[PDB]
C-alpha cells in the first residue's frame, strides 16, 4: 500500500494473509473472507500449498488472535488468462471453518452486475509494499477514488470494463502495489474489487477485479 496509513489493529477481520511461499515461489498475497470456509483472492496468487491466516495485523508476530488455517483447495477461474490477465479471481476453501469473532468475520459481497460509477471513494487494505525499497509487517490501507474506464483504456492493453475496474487517481502517489494482489477494494462497506495488476511503477490508475461480475461462479463454486 503506497501512501497509505496503518489500519487500526483488527479493524478489518475479513482481511486474509496469503503465504504462497511453498508450492509457487514465496511472495505474500492479499485476500478477504467471503464465507466461513472461503477466502477470495486473485487467481494469480495461486500455489500448490497456501497457508491463510485470519485475524491478524502484524504477520511478523505470533498474535493470539491470529488464525493459521491452510487452504484445502485453491480454485482458479476456468477462464483465467495469463497473457491478458482476464478473469483474475480465485477462491480458497480453508481446511476448516474459521472461528467467527470480533477479529475474524466475512465481508459482504456486492450484487450481480452491481456497477461502481467513477468518483466513488473506496478503501483498499493489505500488507503489500509501501514502496519499492521498503515494506511493512503491519496491515496498512488507503482510499482510492474509482476513475472512469476511459483512463485505464488508454493505459493498459487488455482492460475489460465488464470484469475489470479502473481505480486510483494518477494525481495522487497512493495506490495498491506489490504484495497487495488479492486485497479487496471495499466501497460502501462492500468488497467490490480485487487488486489484480497495474503499472510496475506503482503509479495509478490501477486495474482491479470486478467481483460483481463473477458472482454466478462465486456462488456456484462455494455452493
Ligand atoms: O507483480 C505483481 C505486481 C506488479 C506491479 C504492480 C503495480 C501496481 C499494483 C499491483 C502490482 C502487482 C504481482 C504478481 C506476482 C507474481 C506473478 C503474477 C502473475 C500475474 C499477475 C500478478 C503477479 P503480486 O506479487 O501477487 O503482488
Cell of 60: 511478523
Cα–ligand 1 centroid distance for 100 (angstroms): 30
Which residue out of 30, 44, 85 has the highest number of ligand 1 atoms within 8 Å of its CB and is therefore the one to mutate? Answer: 44
Active site residues: 44, 88, 181
Cα–ligand 1 centroid distance for 72 (angstroms): 24
- The closest residue, in CA terms, to atom 9 on ligand 1 is 177
Q: Are 108 and 190 in contact (CB under 8 A)?
A: yes
Locate the DSSP E strands across the chain. Answer: 5-6, 32-33, 38-41, 51-54, 67-76, 90-94, 121-126, 140-145, 164-167, 184-186, 191-198, 206-210
Cα–ligand 1 centroid distance for 183 (angstroms): 12
**Within 6 Å (CB) of ligand 1, which residues are found?**
27, 29, 44-45, 85, 176-179, 181, 195, 197-200, 202, 206
Domains and CATH numbers, the chain: 1-12+107-212 (2.40.10.10), 13-106+213-223 (2.40.10.10)
Q: Are 185 and 194 in contact (CB under 8 A)?
A: yes
What residues does 71 pair with on adjacent strands?
94
Residues 6 or more apart from 100 whose CB is under 8 A from it? 36, 106
Sequence-separated contacts (24+) of 153-162 with Cβ below 8 Å? 155/199, 155/205, 156/207, 157/84, 158/81, 158/83, 158/84, 158/85, 158/86, 159/207, 160/86, 162/210, 162/213
Which residue out of 42, 194, 197 has the highest number of ligand 1 atoms within 8 Å of its CB and is therefore the one to mutate? Answer: 197
Amino acid at each position: 500500500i503506497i501512501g497509505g496509513r496503518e489500519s487500526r489493529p483488527h479493524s478489518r477481520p475479513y482481511m486474509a494473509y496469503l503465504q504462497i511461499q511453498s508450492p509457487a515461489g514465496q511472495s505474500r498475497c492479499g485476500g478477504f473472507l467471503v464465507r466461513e470456509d472461503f477466502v477470495l483472492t486473485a487467481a494469480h496468487c495461486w500455489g500448490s500449498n497456501i497457508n491463510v491466516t485470519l485475524g491478524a495485523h502484524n504477520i511478523q508476530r505470533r498474535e493470539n488472535t491470529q488464525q493459521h488455517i491452510t487452504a484445502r483447495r485453491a480454485i482458479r477461474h476456468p477462464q483465467y488468462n495469463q497473457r491478458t490477465i482476464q478473469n483474475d479471481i480465485m477462491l480458497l476453501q480453508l481446511s476448516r471453518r474459521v472461528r467467527r469473532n470480533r477479529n475474524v468475520n466475512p465481508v459482504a459481497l456486492p450484487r450481480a452486475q452491481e456497477g461502481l460509477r467513477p468518483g466513488t471513494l473506496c478503501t483498499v487494505a493489505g500488507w503489500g509494499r509501501v514502496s519499492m525499497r521498503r515494506g511493512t509487517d503491519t496491515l496498512r490501507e488507503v482510499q482510492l477514488r474509482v476513475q472512469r474506464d476511459r483512463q485505464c483504456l488508454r493505459i493498459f492493453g487488455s482492460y475489460d470494463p465488464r470484469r475489470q475496474i479502473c481505480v486510483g487517481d494518477r494525481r495522487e502517489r497512493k495506490a495498491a502495489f506489490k504484495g497487495d494482489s488479492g486485497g479487496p477494494l471495499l466501497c460502501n462497506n462492500v468488497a467490490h474489487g480485487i487488486v489484480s495488476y497495474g503499472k510496475s511503477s506503482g503509479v495509478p490508475p490501477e486495474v482491479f477485479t470486478r467481483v460483481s461480475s463473477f458472482l454466478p461462479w462465486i456462488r456456484t463454486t462455494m455452493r
